[PDB]
Design an enzyme around this catalytic site. Structure first.
Site, PDB file in Angstrom:
ATOM      1  N   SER A 258       4.289   2.355   8.721  1.00  0.00           N
ATOM      2  CA  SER A 258       4.271   1.403   8.027  1.00  0.00           C
ATOM      3  C   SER A 258       5.564   0.802   7.134  1.00  0.00           C
ATOM      4  O   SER A 258       6.407   1.213   6.982  1.00  0.00           O
ATOM      5  CB  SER A 258       3.076   0.863   7.219  1.00  0.00           C
ATOM      6  OG  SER A 258       3.363   1.641   6.089  1.00  0.00           O
TER       7      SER A 258
ATOM      8  N   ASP B  41      -0.002  -7.157   1.326  1.00  0.00           N
ATOM      9  CA  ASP B  41      -0.635  -6.185   1.496  1.00  0.00           C
ATOM     10  C   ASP B  41       1.601  -5.780   1.138  1.00  0.00           C
ATOM     11  O   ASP B  41       1.733  -5.382   2.965  1.00  0.00           O
ATOM     12  CB  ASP B  41      -0.871  -5.379   2.748  1.00  0.00           C
ATOM     13  CG  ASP B  41      -0.057  -3.784   2.351  1.00  0.00           C
ATOM     14  OD1 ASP B  41      -0.518  -3.361   3.571  1.00  0.00           O
ATOM     15  OD2 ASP B  41      -0.102  -3.475   1.219  1.00  0.00           O
TER      16      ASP B  41
ATOM     17  N   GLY C 289       3.135   7.043   8.787  1.00  0.00           N
ATOM     18  CA  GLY C 289       4.405   6.616   8.250  1.00  0.00           C
ATOM     19  C   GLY C 289       5.671   5.971   8.965  1.00  0.00           C
ATOM     20  O   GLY C 289       6.541   6.304   8.632  1.00  0.00           O
TER      21      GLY C 289
ATOM     22  N   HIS D 204       0.697  -0.745  -0.020  1.00  0.00           N
ATOM     23  CA  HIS D 204       0.106  -0.202   0.016  1.00  0.00           C
ATOM     24  C   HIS D 204       1.035   1.783   0.082  1.00  0.00           C
ATOM     25  O   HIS D 204       0.287   2.716  -0.393  1.00  0.00           O
ATOM     26  CB  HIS D 204      -0.925   0.067   0.878  1.00  0.00           C
ATOM     27  CG  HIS D 204      -1.127   0.194   2.388  1.00  0.00           C
ATOM     28  ND1 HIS D 204      -0.249  -1.073   3.589  1.00  0.00           N
ATOM     29  CD2 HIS D 204      -0.110   1.238   2.641  1.00  0.00           C
ATOM     30  CE1 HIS D 204      -0.192  -0.161   4.725  1.00  0.00           C
ATOM     31  NE2 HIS D 204       0.298   1.218   4.460  1.00  0.00           N
TER      32      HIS D 204
END
Ligand SMILES: Nc1ncnc2c1ncn2[C@@H]1O[C@H](COP(=O)(O)OP(=O)(O)O)[C@@H](O)[C@H]1O
Ligand SMILES: Nc1ncnc2c1ncn2[C@@H]1O[C@H](COP(=O)(O)OP(=O)(O)O)[C@@H](O)[C@H]1O
Ligand code: BEF
Ligand code: BEF
Ligand SMILES: [Mg+2]
Ligand SMILES: [Mg+2]
EC number: 3.4.22.-
Lengths: 645, 645
Positions: free
Chosen positions: B153, B95, B151, B71
């Protein structure tokens, strides 16, 4: 880096006014060009699409000058063929800047026909009809979400003839829906062009026959807070100097006797001395506490460090400007090293050296070499008290004599002599002389912003952001005071100076209610005096709005308020008021964070959802949005609020 | 744009777990480097701070691979010493993406400790305690606003020994307050590494003995929609082909007859043909309207153009996946040229030429040369109907035969033969063969995003955004079908493909209630089947939330709903329900925009504030938050909502 032309809006020549967009460079060229400040592209037309690294907006050429908004462009250069073009005009009061139009640009001709049918050209090249209402206002024929206008700052408002009436600067909204537009009129551009480009306010103002407000602008350490008042007094004048800094005010008390043969009165929380000297130093806060201007007490009032935009300073200066003339003062001096629109320029005493990634001590993504602070005296700026504590501990563990200093500690913790590294917040940014061989700057700070979030009302948010040019030059200025010094930094940039947020206005009403016994109406009078005074930091005019809010917050709990005042955290009045409403409803506070400790003793009796008035932090508990006060504040938010686009 | 390493988070190697950051570049490099793909910088550490031109997040090295979230990075290459580095792994379902770890990077050891005390490392180098709850879930010890986790991830969750348990991907929230974290476990990294580099899906799946769902991926124009079903029919199978496009579905009839000697059944909203043939082409919409799968009717159901993420497609495909086996189908085929994670590659039939600023027809900041479309057959994509109308009028105009096609126009507006310039929305993006010599692509599109804005509930917002890779390849693919063609474009870029917003789920429940007589529970079953099927576009799992919301919306006004359905605007059920609430409350709608026209007849009788349920556009009227439905929906938002970081 430089503002960059990245495209243009082409206006129709004949007939009904239409527009279309031409884009001339992508992101890569934009950035590269923003750096070299060298833009080789041919410029055409009169409306340019301009971009910084982070924002995009418009610029309109009138009279051979490319005009745009200060709030968008700051004091930035515009990328040009020969390289960066410095602004010819920087008018923060009018939110207007201008660069000499580059070759190829054509200018719109000023509208002089008083036509009230207007057309606003947006960055998307829409043309929207606007009915002129005043010299600088016009209503939209069909309202739109503000988001729609965002990025059209700097764009022209045109008469049916295609003549320019002014440039777009701001939207007037009702809960996020734009209903009117505010613009800088072409006549302001005209006034600007026939005014001095250079305004060297470096000499102390003469004392005039009748009341005048004047500005004193000179570099850090030059003598503004010391030499200047001493010279006024030596000429027979009674002088009051107001400074935002306790540490600095105490410093003047110890310094002025031997430096200028004057032993001044001193007025602060921890120290009030009457010597009967014709010079007095006071903080803005103590000045406010003592009730402001006393009739016939002073010939000259110096509003010192008038770059400070903390609420205490704003309210203090507004009070001076409202009261001084009646109180018999002949002169108010607004003194600062960093006025609105200033950028950091070389200081003769100060060598600047970027930090690199080499060094023993991690510091904001870079490193400090232990040998840079091993011996001598040094000041290191951190953005938060927590970082101050942490860095101080680390250095102490390395055998460095380190001391943290910030809001709520006593000035005495800093040793005045001997080796030391002081690790401070902006508690030490302004006014203070600590005899530092160097300053090390994190280049970031904490700020508060209001968001009209309608959930249910407003939110006060805290975030850490890049420092502006006031912070960079003032922090830097803590060294190089009468002698050589060094400035080390993490990052080279700076945000534009001289603007502050609507939340500070909220903070002023709070403080008036909490600390200074001011009715909201009384605070408005003082703040209005501030806003009406040219050359000071600027803010959106939300006075009517904030006054209406606080005017409805009646019957606060005196006990909770004394407690929030005592604990010394932000918005003591708003906090105690939410707590009051909670108590009377036997409901919990929004969260059990420290913010809400005045309620802890009632914790076992508080249940159900919080009657939320507004948002001052994270809200963890369920909420209900139908308390009468909530409904009142919602109603307050129906009034016109001007917001920038 | 490549992902760029802009810094790292240095972790301790022993004792309590600590972290600190080192920064290796600003927008210098970053934006530059992401646009050039070249990064000579030497990599160190196990945690990298990475950035695109627009967002910043983390990457964590494990088993010699630099991992991060799909993502955030999409299928982007990682800037490297000798140029952009292609992802080695791309797992949209999980993901998770990875590049081979650059030289100089070290990897963390996977955790086998089975410990339940974890530590999450943030982008600010904070280390925060997390208690393991599941395989991919963990609770924060102290809840924080979600903004704090933003911010972060791609960041590691570490067990006390400093071994990696996985990487952070999303926050589980209660009204914007994160209370838990969702992460991609290291075992998923393990599974991803052991999975085939490339699985070839270009050949028609064999019909299995027992039910199977299978994928078919092949370039635009290869024959997935025509040759493939014709081949299956020759083998004696009954084949249903579901396609998103009305225009393409109608086109199949005549063409299949002439090219393949099959006269297929054709099922659309506007036209049905039943021939009794063993192949049927239906829109997803008409399929849903028909009640879904009919017992024993088909052997093979092709979910065609399964890249399509409009609500009708998603609900349609979900229905197939839930119902096909029970209905006696043996094979479901998920067919597309542009599967999740795909990027646009060159097409053998298509020459691509960027538009310049040179040309007589302004077009999205660039220009179209008259000679490129005068004449022959051309398809121009605009982002909106209004733009299609404006540009068609302009082309004719210059005497060009142009027509706009978009939803609400009859397919017959498009001439099948002779010179034409068709100006269309995405109504013509997928499926269709119109015999175009070229496509000209504005490269932007209109998308809807939900914001859980709590003012009082949620907001559905419409925005214009850069096209994703599905849009680029699909729009491009309207030309070069069985012959050479030309693709002209405004800008080079593409956003990552394969994800869609939560608002689409909202649209699905809305359509279920409004058009297909599905209870919210019924809709959830169908959407659950979609979400559980690997290899399809992915979405945040907000099924329980949305179902809860629609379940509360009882006793809608049948006449209002009939009217919003007929007007064809976005969310007919939610709009008619707000209208119902307003009419019963004798209150005005949020505004008098066209969205609320069903209430105009009642206008004279409606006064006071709007009982606002949610936000579907601008709200001009004063609002009240007292309505029981408002409170019902607020209560629904208290449910756990996972959102990405
Ligand atoms: N408390 C103090 N201790 C020692 N020196 C001081 C002190 N205050 C001022 N000075 C000296 O006086 C000079 C002028 O200081 P000040 O008037 O505070 O400057 P300005 O207000 O222009 O920044 C400084 O550069 C420093 O040399
Ligand atoms: N309606 C049509 N009119 C004319 N030719 C068509 C039509 N549909 C398909 N074709 C031809 O059949 C080929 C395969 O089309 P299609 O099966 O729609 O491809 P895919 O579904 O793989 O994009 C096209 O490249 C074109 O040559
Ligand atoms: F300008 Be000085 F540092 F007050
Ligand atoms: F892949 Be084809 F254009 F449907
Ligand atoms: Mg000073
Ligand atoms: Mg197809």
């Amino acid at each position: 880096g430089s503002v960059v032309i990245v495209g243009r809006i082409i206006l129709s020549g004949s007939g009904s006014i239409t527009a279309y967009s031409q884009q001339t460079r992508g992101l890569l060229g934009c950035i590269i060009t923003s750096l070299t400040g060298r833009d080789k592209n041919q410029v055409e037309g009169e409306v340019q699409v301009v971009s910084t690294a982070t924002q995009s907006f418009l610029a309109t050429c009138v009279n051979g000058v490319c005009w745009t908004v200060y709030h968008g462009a700051g004091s930035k250069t515009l990328a040009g063929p020969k390289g960066p073009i410095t602004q010819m005009y920087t008018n923060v009061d009018q939110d207007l800047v201008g660069w000499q139009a580059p070759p190829g640009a054509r200018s719109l001709t000023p509208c002089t026909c008083g036509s009230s049918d207007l057309y606003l050209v947006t960055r998307h090249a829409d043309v929207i009809p606007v009915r002129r209402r005043g010299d600088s206002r016009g209503s939209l024929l069909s309202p739109r979400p503000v988001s729609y206008l965002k990025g059209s700052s700097g764009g022209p408002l045109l008469c049916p003839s295609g003549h320019a009436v002014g440039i777009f600067r701001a939207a007037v909204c009702t809960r996020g829906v734009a209903k009117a537009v505010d613009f800088v009129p072409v006549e302001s551009m005209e006034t600007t062009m026939r005014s001095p480009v250079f305004t060297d306010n470096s000499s102390p103002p003469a004392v005039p026959q009748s009341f005048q407000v004047a500005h004193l602008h000179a570099p850090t350490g030059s003598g503004k807070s010391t030499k200047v008042p001493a010279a006024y007094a030596a000429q027979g004048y009674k002088v009051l100097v107001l400074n935002p800094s306790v540490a600095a005010t105490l410093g003047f008390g110890a310094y002025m006797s031997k430096a200028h043969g004057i032993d001044p009165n001193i007025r602060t929380g921890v120290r009030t001395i009457t010597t009967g000297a014709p010079v007095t130093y006071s903080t803005y806060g103590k000045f406010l506490a003592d009730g402001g201007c006393s009739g016939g007490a002073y010939d000259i009032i110096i509003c010192d460090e008038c770059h400070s935009t903390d609420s205490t300073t704003i309210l203090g200066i507004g009070t001076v400007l409202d009261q001084a003339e009646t109180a018999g003062a002949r002169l108010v001096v607004l003194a600062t090293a960093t006025p609105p629109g200033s950028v950091t320029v070389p200081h003769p005493n100060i060598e600047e050296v970027a930090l690199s990634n080499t060094g023993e001590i991690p510091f904001y993504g870079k490193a400090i070499p232990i040998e840079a602070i091993r011996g001598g005296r040094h000041l290191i700026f951190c953005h938060s008290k927590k970082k101050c504590d942490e860095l101080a501990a680390k250095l102490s563990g390395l055998g460095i004599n380190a001391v943290a200093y910030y809001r709520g500690l006593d000035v005495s913790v800093i040793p005045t002599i001997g080796d030391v590294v002081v690790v401070a917040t902006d508690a030490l940014m302004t006014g203070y002389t600590g005899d530092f061989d160097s300053v090390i700057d994190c280049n970031t700070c904490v700020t508060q912003t209001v968001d009209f979030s309608l959930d249910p009302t407003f939110t006060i948010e805290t975030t850490t952001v890049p420092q502006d040019a006031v912070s960079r030059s003032q922090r830097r200025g803590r060294t190089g005071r009468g002698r050589r010094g060094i400035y080390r930094f993490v990052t080279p940039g700076e945000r534009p100076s001289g603007m502050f947020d609507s939340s500070v206005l909220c903070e002023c009403y709070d403080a008036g209610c909490a600390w200074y016994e001011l009715t909201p109406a009384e605070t408005s009078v003082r703040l209005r005096a501030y806003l009406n005074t040219p050359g000071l930091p600027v803010c959106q005019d939300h006075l009517e709005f904030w006054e209406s809010v606080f005017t409805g917050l009646t019957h606060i709990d005196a006990h909770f308020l004394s407690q929030t005042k005592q604990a010394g955290d932000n918005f003591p009045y708003l906090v105690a008021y939410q707590a009051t409403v909670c108590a009377r409803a036997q409901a919990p506070p929004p969260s059990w964070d420290q913010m809400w400790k005045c309620l802890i003793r009632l914790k076992p009796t508080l249940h159900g959802p919080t009657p939320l008035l507004y948002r001052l932090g994270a809200v963890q508990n369920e909420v209900t949005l139908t308390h009468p006060i909530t409904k009142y504040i919602m109603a307050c938010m129906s009034a016109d609020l001007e917001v920038v686009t």
